[PDB]
Amino acid sequence: MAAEPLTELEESIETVVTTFFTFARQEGRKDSLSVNEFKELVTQQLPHLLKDVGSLDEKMKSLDVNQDSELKFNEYWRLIGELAKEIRKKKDLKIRKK
Amino acid sequence: MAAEPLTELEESIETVVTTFFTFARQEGRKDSLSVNEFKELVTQQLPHLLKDVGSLDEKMKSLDVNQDSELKFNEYWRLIGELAKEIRKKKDLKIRKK
Incomplete structure (x- = not known):
């Protein structure tokens, strides 16, 4: 409702x-999930392509540091932001490819 | 989905x-709007509560620096993340306010 x-x-x-x-x-x-866990979830939830460059590396090290840590929604936010900034849907992602 | x-x-x-x-x-x-603009637009789009403390500060200064400038989806993301961090709707979301 x-x-x-x-x-x-x-x-x-x-x-x-x-x-x-x-x-x-x-x-x-x-709150959210664990950090590495999150990284493995997003690549699953996003089947589209995973071309991931630039912030891929940034995020990778950020996880590498202490992924044992919990993630939390606000930080998750930034990270999926980076994920969009990485995996740029060409236009019509639901097309799968063609 | x-x-x-x-x-x-x-x-x-x-x-x-x-x-x-x-x-x-x-x-x-x-990519997105201007920074300052973005902040006002999200404020307008979120009439929900606007209790906004905590990242109010981070975000306010983050805008202030060069708030005029064009924002991109990367920055925007973090910033709406911070907005969620601020307006922690959580439960009483559709309950509105009144």
Whole structure:
């Protein structure tokens, strides 16, 4: 249900935050996942291409440091930002390729 | 969720990158808006609560530096992440405020 003045931006954000809950049916969810875990999840969740250059390296070292650490939603954010900045959907990603 | 075999996580990312285009009409966008502009636009898009403390500071100065300048999706990402860090909607999201 909904009855709030949401807008597409808000909707994107509410989707992300709720998706930590609706991860793959996940009760007792804390914040986000673990850091390396996250890296392995995103490459799965994004089947599209994984061309990943530039921030690939940045993120790789960031995980390498202490991936044992928990990730948290705000940091997750930056990291998937970097992931978009890496894996740039050509236009119509849902096309798969053709 | 979609049909290539992409998951809800990736689903959110395509929605964000889309929504730069589906912002407020232009014949194909660049990367994001101007920094300051971006901050006001997200404020407008998120009427939800706007309690904004913590990353209010990080983000305020981050904008201030050269807030005029063109923002790109990379920076934008972190910044809306910080916005989630700030407005920690969490539970009472669709509950709005009143």
